[PDB]
Amino acid sequence: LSRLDKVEAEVQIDRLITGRLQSLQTYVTQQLIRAAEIRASANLAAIKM
Amino acid sequence: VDCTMYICGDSTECSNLLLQYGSFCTQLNRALTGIAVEQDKNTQEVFAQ
């Protein structure tokens, strides 16, 4: 944003958006699977209790 | 999976391009190794009682 005019910048920004958004999706998916593992362990602990 | 040999194979040119995506190959190899250690854990806890 300090360095390229709007239409040249928009292509570079779209590359950053794409890769960052894919990094966020990877994070949230792995967190959903970890959440299922902890949910199962919490259900086991409720039964043990 | 060697994420680099999968995506690029022998090419250095592809390997340099791939490095600009950063951690994603490490995340993938780490996930598959965790899955792999869980299979020994599964067999241990079923049979080694």
Tell me, letter by letter, the H, E, C secondary structure of B1-49: CCHHHHHCCCCHHHHHHHHCCCCHHHHHHHHHHHHHHHHHHHHHHHHCC
- Per CB-CB distance under 8 Å, the chain A contacts of B42 are none
Cβ contact B21–A30 (<8 Å): no
Resolution, given in Å to one decimal, reads: 3.3
User: Do the beta carbons of residue B28 and residue B3 sit within 8 Å?
Assistant: yes
The pair of three-digit structure tokens given for residue A2, joined into one six-digit string: 């300090």
Residue A40 DSSP SS3: helix
The experimental technique used to determine this model is cryo-EM
> How many whole angstroms separate alpha carbon B41 and alpha carbon B48?
10
> How many whole angstroms separate alpha carbon A34 and alpha carbon B42?
17
Cβ contact A19–B21 (<8 Å): yes
A4: left (phi over 0), alpha (psi -120 to 50) or beta: beta
Cα within 13 Å of Cα(B17), Cβ side: 7
